[PDB]
RNA sequence: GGGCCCGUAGCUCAGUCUGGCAGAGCGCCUGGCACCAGGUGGUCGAGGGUUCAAAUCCCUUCGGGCCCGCCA
């Protein structure tokens, strides 16, 4: 319907309130997202693949974690008081939550550096050589296995 | 993370509950006139345990498939 809007924001203090407002959005840990392609592929899996979660936006989070467990996904790639990736379909929705966490918007916060690569490879159990994001998508694609 | 089913002849699978000679159909070989008769079939996924006796029960494990919970 609406085009997905994805923008990372640097230095955000997360308030658990935002999850009790019934707003169509998803917020991730920017420091563990391979790139904008990571989130896009997760949304693709959420849109198409067989549901694991009772919500589409929750389905994004679990697909981003590369595994079925819902609570593990919240820990693996859930937003943690800092660099985050806000995901919306309504501009007003994005504006609302940003007012509740703050932080200068910086899409580079979703770009990957060597320290982020070590973190992602350790987190996503990426044991081996090969382009990090390529095998991040590969791990997400086979959640249905 | 939790729960369930399959694995047995070359193939499809019964048999497992309730331990008691390893079975059917299918094909395969032979002979006879597609059909008839004779013949042919086993690392029971693996290991270990229990037992006089295990495909069968217990533990463990490999391979294939299915379901579920977690919903900041």
Numbering used by the authors: 3 to 147
The article reads:
Overall, mjCgi121 engaged the tRNA in a manner that sterically caps its free 5′ and 3′ termini. mjCgi121 contacts the tRNA through an extensive surface (1162 Å2) involving helices-α1, -α3, and -α4, in agreement with the NMR analysis. Contacts with the tRNA are directed largely at the universal 3′ CCA tail (C74, C75, and A76), and to a lesser degree at G73. The mjCgi121–tRNA interface involves a mixture of hydrophobic, hydrogen-bonding and salt interactions. The base of A76 engages a deep hydrophobic pocket formed by Gly80 and the side chains of Phe21, Met60, and Ile76. The ribose 3′ hydroxyl group of A76 is tightly packed against Cgi121, which may disfavor the binding of aminoacylated tRNAs. The base of C75 forms hydrophobic contacts with the side chains of Lys56, Met60, and Ile72. The base of C74 forms hydrophobic contacts with the Ile72 side chain, and a hydrogen-bond with the peptide backbone of Ile72. In conclusion, these crystallographic analyses revealed a binding mode of mjCgi121 to tRNA that is counter-intuitively directed at a universal element of tRNAs that is maximally distant (>65 Å) from the A37 site of t6A modification.
The KEOPS complex, which is conserved across archaea and eukaryotes, is composed of four core subunits; Pcc1, Kae1, Bud32 and Cgi121. Kae1 catalyzes the universal and essential tRNA modification N6-threonylcarbamoyl adenosine, but the precise roles of all other KEOPS subunits remain an enigma. Here we show using structure-guided studies that Cgi121 recruits tRNA to KEOPS by binding to its 3’ CCA tail. A composite model of KEOPS bound to tRNA reveals that all KEOPS subunits form an extended tRNA-binding surface that we have validated in vitro and in vivo to mediate the interaction with the tRNA substrate and its modification.
